[PDB]
Design a protein around this nucleic acid. Structure first.
Lengths: 333, 87, 332, 87
DNA sequence: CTGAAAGCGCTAACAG
DNA sequence: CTGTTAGCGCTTTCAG
C-alpha cells in the first residue's frame, strides 16, 4: 500500500490517468505536466507495479520458454538467442526444463498460460498430434525452435536436418568414401529417424551405395555414447572409412574413442560432427562440423513471436535458416 | 548512402554480433538496408538479416537513405569492426 | 473473455469466496460444497489467473534470476540447479543475462522487482557498494551464488576460492614443482584478484617459494585466452613445470596450446583446471581439476531462498559448500 | 528401519541424483535422516544433505521412524541404485 | 462454514 | 490535454 500511482497523482495535483500516460510515455502530456509528475516519482521513489499493469492491460510482456535441458551446451546457446531478442523487444522470459517428458511438457504449457504470458517458444524432441492440438487452442501464439513437427502446421524456425546430413554424406562420397557410418541419436525423436536418417540414406541411394544397418549406431546425445559408438563400429567385420555424427558431443567422443585404440585422425579415419558448437574448436584435431546457426534459430524464433504477438501479418510461419558444412582438421584433403 | 564491406569475422554475420548491428541500424530514423550478393534486406530486421546466411568471405553492401543517413552509415562502420565483422 | 472465479461461483450457488477457498485448498469447506464446486470447475474448464491472484495475494510464486551469460558451460549448470530446486517448491523462474554490465544488472534487478518477484538469485563477478546499496532496497530476499561480495552483507552460497586455490598449489609443490604459474581471469573482478590470486600467493611463501610476477597470466575464461597464456608462458626463460588455470575452458586452451608446440602432457608439464565441468572430461588426457559442486551451489542457493522467502529463520546466511580435488590424466 | 549403502557415484552424492533422492525421502511421513561420518541431516532437506559433501567411496545409513518407515526404505533403496548411488 | 465488504495497483475511454 | 468512469480476476475479512 506504499507509494502507488495514486500517491504520485496527489504529489502532482493531477489524476492517475496522467501519472499513467506519463509512466507509459504517452504523447498527450504537457511537457510541464510530464516534468512535475516525473519529479514526484523521483521524490517518493515510485516503482510501477507490473502485475497490476498486467491485470488492467491484459498483457504481461513476458513469454514462456519451454526447453528440455538448459545445462546443454546446445540449448544454452539456443536460449541465449531467444533471451537477447526478447530483451531487444522489451520482453521477459519464464524458463523451465521439460527433459522431454510429455507430461511435464504439456503441464508447463498450462502453468505458463496460467501466468498469462503473451507468447511461448517451444523446444521439444517429440511433438505429438496432441501437442499440436494443445498448441492450436492457445490464447497466445506458439513458436517452435530447432524442433521437428511432422504435421507442420504450428509456426517454427529451424534448418533442414534432412538436407544437412545428405550434404555431409554426399561430401564424404565425393572424396572416395564407400562405407560411411551414421552415429545418430534416439530414434524415438522424429528428427533422427524421420529427418537425419532419411537424409543419410537418400545420399547413399543417390550414390548407388547399399544401405548397411551395421553402419548405423544409436547414441543418446551423450559423449560417452560417442565412445561406445566408435567401438561397435571398429568392431565389425566390415568397418567404415568415415563416420558422421548427429551431434558435436557424440562426434567429439568418436574422436577420442579412436584416439585410444591407437587410431589416428584424420589419417586413419574421417570424422564429421553436427551443430558447430564452440566444442568443435576445443577438440584436437579440430572437428569438421555441419554448421547450424543455433543462436540465430533462437533469435529468429523469438523475433517471429514478437510479430505474431503484435498481430502483424507474416508470410510463411515456418522458417528455414541456411546451413553449411565447415571442414577443419577432422577430415582429409 | 552506400558502402561495401568484406566479412572478416570467423563466424560470419550471425550470433550476438549480428544483433548489435541490427540494433544499431535501428536507432536511426533513416531506412537502413543490407544487400548480399543477390537480394537485399532491412538491416533493422533480425529475421531479414539472419536468413541471408552471410559467411566469412562475402561482399555485403549497407545503404542508408534518410535524415540521419550520414550518422547512421557512420555508426554502422563503427560496429562492423568494433565487433570484428567486416572491413 | 475467459471464465472467471465468478462463473464458477454461480455454477454452484456459492460465493467467489468459497471457490477461492476450494481452489486454494482451504480447511473451512464442507466436503459436499467442495466436491460440488470442484466438479463445477472441470465442467466449465476453469483455469485460474496467476496475475489476478498475484495482485490480490501479494505473491507470484515466481523468482528472479540474474546471470551473466547463460551460454556458459558453467552458469548454464548453476542455472539448472536453481531451476530444479525452484520447481521442487512450486516456484517459477525469470531469466535474464547481465554479461557483467553494472547498468544492465541493476536495471534487471529493477525490472525484476517491478514484476513483483518473491525472491532473487544473483550472480556476478563484481558486487560493488552501489550494488549492495540497491540490494538493501528490495522488498524480497536476495541470494548470491558462486559470487564474491566483499562487504559480507547479502546471503551467498559458494565455496572458498581462496583456499581452493591454495589446496591446488599445495598438492603441486608436494610433487616437486619449484616454478609454478597461474592463469587467472580478469583481475578487474574480485573473485580472481582478492581470492584466487591470494590463495595462490600464500601457498608460495608458506612453501618458502618466491613470487614470480611473470608466472601470473590474465585471461578471460576464453579457450583462446587459454592458448595465449601457455604460449606467453613458455616464452621467457624461467618456464614453469606446472600451471594452474582459473577455469577449465582455459585449461584445455593451455593443454592444446602445448601439444601444438610439441611438448606432451603430462609428459613435459602438469596442468590443473578449476570447476570440474564436463569439459575437463572430454579432453585427452582427461584434465585434473579443483571440484566445485556447481549444481549444488545453485540448488542450495535457491533452497536457501525458499526459506528466507517463507520468513522461517535460518542459522547463518553465508554458506560455503565443501570443495575438493579430483586428479585424472593431466598430472604425474 | 535402516540400511548401509556404499556410494558408488563417480561424483558422490550431488547433482540431480541427490535431488531425486531427497525428493523421494520427502514423499513419506517418515522422518528420514542421513547418518554420515557421525553427523546426521534430514534427507528431506537439500541444504543439509548437500552440505555434507558425500564424495565417492563412503558409507551412510537411512533412518525411518513413522507410519511408513518401511515403504520408505524400499522406495529409497530403489532410487539409491536407480540413480547409481551405491547399494 | 460461508457470504458479504473492500479493495490490490493500474489501464481505459471520451466528453468538455 | 486531462479528468471521470468502471473494472480486470482474486484474495481478504469477519460477521452470522
Amino acid at each position: 500500500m506504499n507509494i502507488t500511482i495514486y500517491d504520485v497523482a496527489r504529489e502532482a495535483n493531477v489524476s492517475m490517468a496522467t501519472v499513467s500516460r506519463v509512466v507509459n510515455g504517452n504523447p498527450n502530456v504537457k511537457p510541464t505536466t510530464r516534468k512535475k509528475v516525473l519529479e514526484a516519482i523521483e521524490r517518493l521513489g515510485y516503482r510501477p507495479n507490473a502485475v497490476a499493469r498486467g491485470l488492467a492491460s491484459k498483457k504481461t510482456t513476458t513469454v514462456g520458454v519451454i526447453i528440455p535441458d538448459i545445462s546443454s551446451i546446445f540449448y544454452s546457446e539456443l536460449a541465449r538467442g531467444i533471451e537477447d531478442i526478447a530483451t531487444m523487444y522489451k520482453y521477459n522470459i519464464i524458463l523451465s526444463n521439460s527433459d522431454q517428458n510429455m507430461e511435464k511438457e504439456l503441464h508447463l504449457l498450462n502453468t505458463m498460460l496460467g501466468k498469462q504470458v503473451d507468447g511461448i517458444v517451444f523446444m521439444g524432441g517429440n511433438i505429438t498430434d496432441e501437442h499440436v492440438a494443445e498448441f492450436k487452442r492457445s490464447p497466445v501464439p506458439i513458436v517452435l525452435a530447432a524442433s521437428v513437427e511432422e504435421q507442420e502446421e504450428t509456426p517454427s524456425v529451424a534448418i533442414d536436418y534432412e538436407q544437412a546430413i545428405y550434404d555431409a554424406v554426399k561430401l564424404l562420397v565425393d572424396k572416395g568414401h564407400t562405407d560411411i557410418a551414421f552415429v545418430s541419436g534416439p530414434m524415438a525423436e522424429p528428427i533422427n529417424r524421420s529427418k537425419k536418417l532419411q537424409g543419410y540414406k537418400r545420399a547413399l541411394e543417390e550414390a548407388n551405395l547399399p544401405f548397411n544397418e551395421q553402419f548405423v549406431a544409436e547414441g543418446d546425445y551423450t559423449y560417452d555414447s560417442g565412445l561406445e559408438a566408435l567401438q561397435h563400429l571398429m568392431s565389425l567385420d566390415k568397418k567404415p572409412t568415415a563416420i558422421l555424427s548427429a551431434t558435436d558431443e557424440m562426434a567429439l567422443g568418436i574422436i577420442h574413442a579412436a584416439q585410444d585404440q591407437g587410431l589416428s585422425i584424420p589419417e586413419d579415419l574421417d570424422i564429421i560432427g553436427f551443430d558447430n558448437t564452440r566444442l568443435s574448436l576445443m577438440v584436437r584435431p579440430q572437428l569438421s562440423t555441419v554448421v547450424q546457426p543455433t543462436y540465430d534459430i533462437g533469435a529468429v524464433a523469438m523475433r517471429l513471436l514478437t510479430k505474431l504477438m503484435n498481430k502483424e501479418p507474416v508470410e510463411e510461419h515456418i522458417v528455414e535458416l541456411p546451413h553449411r558444412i565447415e571442414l577443419r582438421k577432422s577430415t582429409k584433403a | 548512402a552506400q558502402k561495401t564491406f568484406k566479412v572478416t569475422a570467423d563466424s560470419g554475420i550471425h550470433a550476438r554480433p549480428a544483433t548489435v548491428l541490427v540494433q544499431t541500424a535501428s536507432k536511426y530514423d533513416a531506412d537502413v538496408n543490407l544487400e548480399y550478393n543477390g537480394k537485399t534486406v532491412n538491416l533493422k530486421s533480425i529475421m531479414g538479416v539472419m536468413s541471408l546466411g552471410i559467411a566469412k568471405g562475402a561482399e555485403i553492401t549497407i545503404s542508408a537513405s534518410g535524415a540521419d543517413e550520414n550518422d547512421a552509415l557512420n555508426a554502422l562502420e563503427e560496429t562492423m569492426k568494433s565487433e570484428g565483422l567486416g572491413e
